[PDB]
Amino acid sequence: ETLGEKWKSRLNALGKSEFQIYKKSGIQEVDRTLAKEGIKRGETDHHAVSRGSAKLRWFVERNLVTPEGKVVDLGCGRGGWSYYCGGLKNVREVKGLTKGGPGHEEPIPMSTYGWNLVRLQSGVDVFFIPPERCDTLLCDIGESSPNPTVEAGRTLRVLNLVENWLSNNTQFCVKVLNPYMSSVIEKMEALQRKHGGALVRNPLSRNSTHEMYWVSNASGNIVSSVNMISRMLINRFTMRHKKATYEPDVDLGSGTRN
Ligand SMILES: C[n+]1cn([C@@H]2O[C@H](COP(=O)(O)OP(=O)(O)OP(=O)(O)OC[C@H]3O[C@@H](n4cnc5c(N)ncnc54)[C@H](O)[C@@H]3O)[C@@H](O)[C@H]2O)c2nc(N)[nH]c(=O)c21
Ligand SMILES: Nc1ncnc2c1ncn2[C@@H]1O[C@H](CSCC[C@H](N)C(=O)O)[C@@H](O)[C@H]1O
Structure with a gap:
């Protein structure tokens, strides 16, 4: 058994209140109140549609992914990553695809800076559509489960999916819903040998998920990067400031790009 698995049982054993306190203990949060109120009226100018943008900014503002040219965002939901890339200096084109429909988030049309570069469709199932050429691949797909084996099945589908989309020296940031299961480690190692990058932990992530993102401009041993984060999350169980920090x-911005 891996350390991630020990962690996952310990998580599932928590009571309802402890769960909600642990989930946000000592993590990082985004001040969203005004942005939401803005959107809940007609406002289309300035706001991120999701806390997803803050999440992507963390990776980029550090040069772990450098989106550019033709960007594909798989599972883009409301559009938080897409709209974010739409205003980055080098990015030429953003295409985003999702499920939408009853029970899922629809794209939300906005006029943030570079909105014209950005094109979103719902009703799409990314697993059965032909791969296209591109320069940067993004993917935030993975529906969590109480059962880590289910999670590994779901994650290995996402991994096989992105492989088919990956070229040569293309930029990427790809959610790995479950990185600790033995079968995922393996696929990740084979994938690292063939495309580079490594796994990195985002501090905006909640303690209730072990997700790590495969980003292109980083290195590090797969096994170590993962165990590091399991030990962290376990350390966080007995925490003594118990508060998120905002x-x-x-x-x-606003307006069209060129
Ligand atoms: C809501 N919840 C989720 N988790 C755990 O955290 C992981 C992700 O949980 P989440 O809050 O991020 O939920 P997710 O993003 O999937 O969306 P949503 O809240 O809609 O789904 C809740 C999922 O948690 C499961 N769940 C609900 N209550 C529990 C519980 N008490 N114990 C274990 N799993 C639970 C549900 O069956 C459901 O699949 C899950 O794999 C689960 O082990 C919980 N654990 C405890 N111990 N008590 C909880 O109340 C709880
Ligand atoms: N098989 C599939 N094909 C297309 N979209 C899928 C999919 N499975 C899940 N998705 C969608 O992908 C989305 C990932 S969550 C979107 C978060 C986004 N990065 C943001 O910043 O707002 C979910 O809304 C989900 O509905």
């Missing part, structure tokens, strides 16, 4: 949202 940071401002992203302003995404």
Whole structure:
């Protein structure tokens, strides 16, 4: 058994209140109140549609992914990553695809900076559509489960999916819903040998998930990067400040790009 698995049982054993307190203990949060109120009226200018943008900004503002040219965002939901890339200096084109429909988030049309570069469709199932050429691949797909084996099945589908989309020296940031299961480690190692990058933990992630993102401009041993984060999450069980710490949202400008 891996350390991640020990962690997952310990999580599932928690009571309802302890769960909600642990989930946000000492993590990082985004001040979203005004951005949401803005959107809940007609406002289309300045706001991120999701806390997803803040999440992507963390990776980029550090040069772990450098989106550019033709960007594909698989499972883009409301559009938080897409709209975010739409205003980055080098990015030429953003295409985003999702499920939508009853029970899922629909794309939300916005006029943030570079909105014209960005094209979103719902009703799409990414697993059965032909791969297209591109320069940067993004993917935030993975529906969590109480059962880590289910999670590994779901994650290995996402991995086989992105492989088919990956070229040569293309930029990427790909959610790995479950990185600790033995079968995922293996696929990740084979994938690292063939495309590079490594796994990195985002501090905006909640303690209730062990997700790590495969980003292109990083290195590090797969096994170590993973165990590091299991030990962290276990350390966080007995924590003694028990509060999230907030940071401002992203302003995404307004207007068309060229
Ligand atoms: C809501 N919840 C989720 N988790 C755990 O955290 C992981 C992700 O949980 P989440 O809050 O991020 O939920 P998710 O993003 O999937 O969306 P949603 O809240 O809609 O789904 C809740 C899922 O948690 C499961 N769940 C609900 N209550 C429990 C529980 N008491 N114990 C274990 N699993 C639970 C549900 O069956 C459901 O699949 C899950 O794999 C599960 O082990 C919980 N654990 C405890 N111990 N008590 C909980 O109340 C709880
Ligand atoms: N098989 C599939 N094909 C297309 N979209 C899928 C999919 N499975 C899940 N998705 C969608 O992908 C989305 C990932 S969550 C979107 C978060 C986004 N990065 C943001 O910043 O807002 C979910 O809304 C889900 O409905």
